[PDB]
């Protein structure tokens, strides 16, 4: 059954998500405006991602055990996971109706052609949409969604990690919490192999991360594109 | 790292 500790973890993660995800998207007004007449969507989506990096950091900080990490280990975990967590969290605005991310208005509704106008090809974008579709098909409980974000961040195998054993221990605590949550709270048939499926999505995200990285390296190699980015994006994603 | 903004947002 779910221990008291485990239900505590869940409550904390739900709150941390509610504190860092504004389902009104009101802050989008502050971004450089979307332009859809090349790379016309890069300023707007660069800003979106920059905002989102900030929110993901604020979520990460609230993950039980995360603070016990070194500063260096917190830094490497966020650097490698940020894109993956933005892809994960983005699923909540994502809609199967038109395979787009719908952030409350036509201006902030993003489709495959918009992403394309930020400098990215179908080699990223097609697997990104399929990922969004498969995740949506899981119909996760919000509790599952926040746990999966946290397990994504606190991954022991990330490049640069120093205290692997400690990152492992934090994550195992969250993995066990997720496994037990599914067993106690998620009815069959939806529960069928749901943990393994959720772990497969984390492998999908590694692959998405790699592809995004290579297309980012290309895009940002040109200084006129790198200019349209934000300082946080350059720092977290590289230069 | 060499990551002042990240390090600052983290605490
Ligand atoms: C608040 C949020 C999330 O944090 C992010 C949201 C959407 C995420 C999207 C939709 C557009 C395409 C996005 C931005 C993807 C795109 C490949 C990022 C490109 C970043 C760049 C710096 C240009 O390489 C990643 C995640 C995708 C809206 C909303 O759900």
**DSSP letter assigned to residue A101:** E
Q: Which of A228, A187, A212 is nearest to A127 (CA)?
A: A212
Domains defined for chain A, CATH in brackets: 1-239 (1.10.565.10)
Q: Which two tokens stand for residue A58?
A: 């604020």
The whole-angstrom distance between residue A192's C-alpha and the CA centroid of its chain comes to: 24
Asked whether A92 lines ligand 1 (CB < 6 A), one says: yes
Angstrom distance (rounded) from CA A214 to CA A210 = 6
Asked whether A49 lines ligand 1 (CB < 6 A), one says: yes
What is chain A's alpha carbon radius of gyration, rounded to the nearest angstrom? 18
Tell me the residues of B at the A interface, defined by beta carbons under 8 Å apart.
1, 3-7, 9-11
Angstrom distance (rounded) from CA A28 to CA A90 = 14
SS3 A24: coil
Q: Is A58 on the interface with B (CB under 8 A)?
A: yes
Task: Read off φ and ψ for residue A221, nearest 5 degrees.
Answer: -65, -40
Other beta carbons within 10 angstroms of residue A179's beta carbon come to 15
Contact check, Cβ <8 Å, B5/A235:
yes
Taking the CA atoms of residue A225, residue A229, residue A234 and residue A235 in that order, the dihedral angle to the nearest 10 degrees is 170
Q: Identify the H or E element spanning A109.
A: strand A109-110
Alpha carbon of A26: minimum distance to chain B alpha carbons (Å): 21
Alpha carbon of B4: minimum distance to chain A alpha carbons (Å): 8
Q: Which two tokens stand for residue A221?
A: 């190699």
Contact check, Cβ <8 Å, B6/A57:
yes
Angstrom distance (rounded) from CA A31 to CA B4 = 23
Q: Is A231 on the interface with B (CB under 8 A)?
A: yes
Angstrom distance (rounded) from CA A38 to CA A238 = 22
Question: Which residue has a Cα nearest atom 2 of ligand 1?
Answer: A90
Q: Which of A67, A43, A42 is nearest to A57 (CA)?
A: A67
Contact by Cβ (8 Å): A109, A48: no
Contact check, Cβ <8 Å, B10/A76:
no
Cα separations in angstroms, A135 against A102, A144, B6: 16, 11, 28
Alpha carbon of A232: minimum distance to chain B alpha carbons (Å): 7
Give the resolution to one decimal, in Å. Answer: 1.9
The full length of chain B comes to 11
Structure solved using which method? X-ray
Contact check, Cβ <8 Å, B9/A236:
no
Q: Which two tokens stand for residue A17?
A: 């998500």
Q: Which of A42, A44, A136 is nearest to A87 (CA)?
A: A136
**DSSP letter assigned to residue A38:** -
Which residue is associated with the tokens 């802050």?
A27
* Helix ranges restricted to H, chain A: 4-20, 42-61, 71-89, 112-116, 122-138, 142-153, 164-185, 194-221, 223-226, 231-237
Other beta carbons within 10 angstroms of residue A190's beta carbon come to 12
């Amino acid at each position: 059954k779910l221990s008291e500790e485990q239900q505590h973890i869940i409550a904390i993660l739900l709150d941390a998500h509610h504190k860092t995800y504004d389902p009104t998207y009101a802050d989008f007004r502050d971004f450089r405006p979307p332009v859809r007449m090349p790379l016309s969507m890069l300023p707007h989506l660069a800003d979106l991602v920059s905002y989102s990096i900030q929110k993901v950091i604020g979520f990460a900080k609230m993950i039980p055990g995360f603070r016990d990490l070194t500063s260096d280990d917190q830094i490497v975990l966020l650097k490698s996971s940020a894109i993956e967590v933005i892809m994960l969290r983005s699923n909540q605005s994502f809609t199967m109706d038109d395979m787009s991310w719908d952030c409350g208005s036509q201006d902030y509704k993003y489709d495959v052609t918009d992403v394309s106008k930020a400098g990215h090809t179908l080699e990223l974008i097609e697997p990104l949409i399929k990922f969004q579709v498969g995740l949506k098909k899981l119909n996760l409980h919000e509790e599952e969604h926040v746990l999966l974000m946290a397990i994504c961040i606190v991954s022991p195998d990330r490049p640069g990690v120093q205290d692997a054993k400690l990152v492992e221990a934090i994550q195992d605590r969250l993995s066990n919490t997720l496994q037990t949550y599914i067993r106690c709270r998620h009815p069959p048939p939806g529960s069928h192999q749901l943990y393994a499926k959720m772990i497969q999505k984390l492998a999908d995200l590694r692959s998405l991360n790699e592809e995004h990285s290579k297309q980012y390296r290309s895009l940002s190699f040109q200084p006129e594109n790198s200019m349209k980015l934000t300082p946080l994006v350059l720092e977290v994603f590289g230069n | 790292k060499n990551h002042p903004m990240l390090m600052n947002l983290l605490k």
